């Protein structure tokens, strides 16, 4: 099975005057490359996929594919939908633009059954020849890919190599790797990056790595090299920023931190996303002061 | 304030050989009109909004608008999105195609803050001159429009005339109508249609009315006439069908029931939606035997 693992970054999408800042986008990806990141996730949830046009979806994948050309860094493009015909199209679309693999969110809002989730991902997997990573975030989608469904998809479809978990359920990550230890469990929650890695997870798709890519990649590589003491040290160290980056819904705090760190020009979102409250703005700025934020 | 209230139906969208069955669609709406329904809700969640193309979105709104010409029945079109610019576009689209009002579900998946929900709905309301009904379904969207946000939108925006609550929270239904008794609380959960109406709710947007429109229409009008004894009697009789119509995710059971009743020709969904399990198929078929299903 072809896999994409290690320290991965859910790229924010900087906007300037209602348009994608294409020069900040490429500049941020080369900052990710230069801080040990193994793969970048363009136009995911942290990249405000939902409010991007499908042309802008193309632009940020092409920028990500080009900026990581000639490097070891892979591009795991966000290509998910709650409509299977659309998800299949987004998967073929990401392949035809150079992405090394796709992250495919569980169908949101329409709450498909487990049988439907299987057929949903089966159609996606059969439409591409690139790796497919499932994304389970039940707090956002309103549905859950069960352990049995994840394992059945991993064994029955050849492109599906694992799942990114954002469920706050370390029990399920024991459930997953105890019954199917060959899959690539990916941490989708920065606060519990080390516990997921120490149980056999093989990477993270991180929000905090937008601001502190060196620390998240160091954390991941420590754990993969079985230096659990140094991996846990970084994880404990980042708990404060890992939690404050979710004081409001992602990616509102991380974009605030990127702006406060002077890494993006504008604290600009696309509605229904907006700037944080003045109190959370201050709290985010206060937690940052404890970290050394790498520049360009 | 211009309002759209009473017994309303969240229309299923019949499929025949992978296409929208346009002649069954109109015939089902005329069955709703003929059984006392006050408004129809095309291309909502029960209509599998997520898996329909924009042209099919256009086709089913136009069919609903045309079928209710010459009747008192209004058209409350589904026109919501987790992108405000898309929701504004869908709202203008529904108005320019004859819809009497729009149902706009809260942004699904990206979890906007309350401030973001306010600006999201303010932009939708200011783009049209037809009534706007909020839709709060947190189990599907991953976010909830709080009582304060619902009340502020009702008072600051003119087209916003109420909310369709599907949250299993009768406390919130007291909270809403006690602090702003002029808003139109609409029940989005069939099992608790009467309790919501008996506290001052002015209508329902029902799933069960697809199968039993006469019973749902009698319930609402009994309650609106303060005949709570006859309204509660119908609500109590409908509890069994109200619950079994959600044994799997809506609209999987209701489309199965419509098919079992011989009202649609094919039990066809669009992925990731699928047919129910053989056991739930039997349970739906068994509960239906206790009810009188009107024909054409
Ligand atoms: Mg009235
Ligand atoms: Mg009367």
Describe this structure in words.
It is classed as lyase. The entry lists the keywords Dihydrodipicolinate synthase, lyase. The structure is a homodimer of 296-residue chains. By secondary structure, the first copy, chain A, is of the alpha/beta class. Chain A has one domain (6-231): TIM Barrel. Chain A is 43% helix and 14% strand. Chain A contains 13 helices and 10 strands. The first copy, chain A, has helices at 22-33, 54-67, 84-95, 114-125, 138-141, 147-156, 170-179, 193-198, 213-224, 228-237, 239-244, 252-260, 278-288, and strands at residues 6-10, 15-16, 19-20, 39-41, 74-78, 101-105, 132-136, 160-165, 184-187, 203-206. An 8-stranded parallel beta barrel of chain A has the order 1-4-5-6-7-8-9-10, surrounded by 7 helices. In chain A, strands 2-3 form a two-stranded antiparallel ribbon. In chain A, strand 4, helix 2 (54-67) and strand 5 form a beta-alpha-beta unit. Chain A is globular. At the A-B interface, helix 4 and helix 5 of A face helix 4 and helix 5 of B. The complex binds magnesium ion (MG) (2 copies).
Spell out the key features of this protein.
homodimer, 296 residues, alpha/beta, TIM Barrel, eight-stranded parallel β-barrel, 13 helices, 43% helix, 14% strand, binds magnesium ion, lyase
- The beta-strand count of chain A equals 10
- The secondary structure category of chain A is alpha/beta
Portion of residues within helices of chain A: 40-55%
Give, in order, the helices and strands of chain A: EEEHEHEHEHEHHEHEHEHHHHH
Provide the CATH architecture of chain A.
Alpha-Beta Barrel
> What is the topology, as strand order, of the major beta sheet of chain A?
1-4-5-6-7-8-9-10
Radius of gyration of chain A: 18 Å
Greatest interface by residues involved: A-B, 37 and 37 residues
Task: Report how far the terminal alpha carbons of chain A are from each other.
Answer: 35 Å
What is the level 1 CATH name of chain A? Alpha Beta
User: What do we call the CATH homologous superfamily of chain A?
Assistant: Aldolase class I
Pfam family, one (chains A, B): DHDPS
Protein name (chains A, B): 4-hydroxy-tetrahydrodipicolinate synthase
Subunit structure (chains A, B): Homotetramer; dimer of dimers.
Function (chains A, B): Catalyzes the condensation of (S)-aspartate-beta-semialdehyde [(S)-ASA] and pyruvate to 4-hydroxy-tetrahydrodipicolinate (HTPA).
